[PDB]
Design a protein around this ligand. Sequence first.
Ligand SMILES: OC[C@]1(O)OC[C@@H](O)[C@@H](O)[C@H]1O
Length: 288
Amino acid sequence: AAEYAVVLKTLSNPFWVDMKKGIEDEAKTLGVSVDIFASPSEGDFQSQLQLFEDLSNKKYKGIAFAPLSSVNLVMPVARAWQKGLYLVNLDEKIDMDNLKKAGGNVEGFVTTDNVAVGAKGADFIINKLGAEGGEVAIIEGKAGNASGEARRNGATEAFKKANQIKLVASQPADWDRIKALDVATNVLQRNPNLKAFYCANDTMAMGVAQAVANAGKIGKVLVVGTDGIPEARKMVEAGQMTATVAQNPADIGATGLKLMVDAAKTGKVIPLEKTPEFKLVDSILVTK
Ligand SMILES: OC[C@]1(O)OC[C@@H](O)[C@@H](O)[C@H]1O
């Protein structure tokens, strides 16, 4: 068993594959051992709670964790803090009000500025649609995820400020490729004059881009994603997606691990009362 455990959402999403590799490479730089785990799919809330608990009860100094929902890991993360494990929240913000209520804390939280991610994707669309503007739609993450909520808020506020843009639809496809295909199909049907989708992640952006293709609207409806996964990058170069707001999962993982190891070296977990460390990882727009 390694000194440190990691719990990622799921390796069915390349974002988490790239975070795993970032963490493995950072461990070699710090000279520490990590055991990395994930859930089989996006919806395995219950399984992930049971996975965390079971890791919490081995001999790990620390756990870095990306929860599948704001709430699902609150109780086991509280228990791990109480037992004196060095905890780092990766990327998807744990409900900190409910964590405090449960008598827990984390050393730190590493994430992207996901309001700026939404703004950046929206701002690209606004500039591409020019003075004519027109109708836009947001394909959301699952409700009750801070990461998705920030991107929706960022893109919605950017759209709102452009008089020539109308946000006609803003609805979830739950980080799911097949749900995004079906939701985006419906949005195009309901809105024949749609000019653009902003999508809260690439898994969903690839479904949306399939929906746009099926309606024979490749190039006439913009598709902007989020993460910069390889298949989304290929689609952007091939002209099937317009753009993606690239994140750096490898850096979020490397940063998270270093925050956990740095904390562990102090020999005392964060006091219940203390604000956790907060580290942002940049995003960039990628177009063809
Ligand atoms: O961990 C939150 C997040 O939003 O979960 C979904 C992933 O595709 C990424 O976008 C990631 O940043």
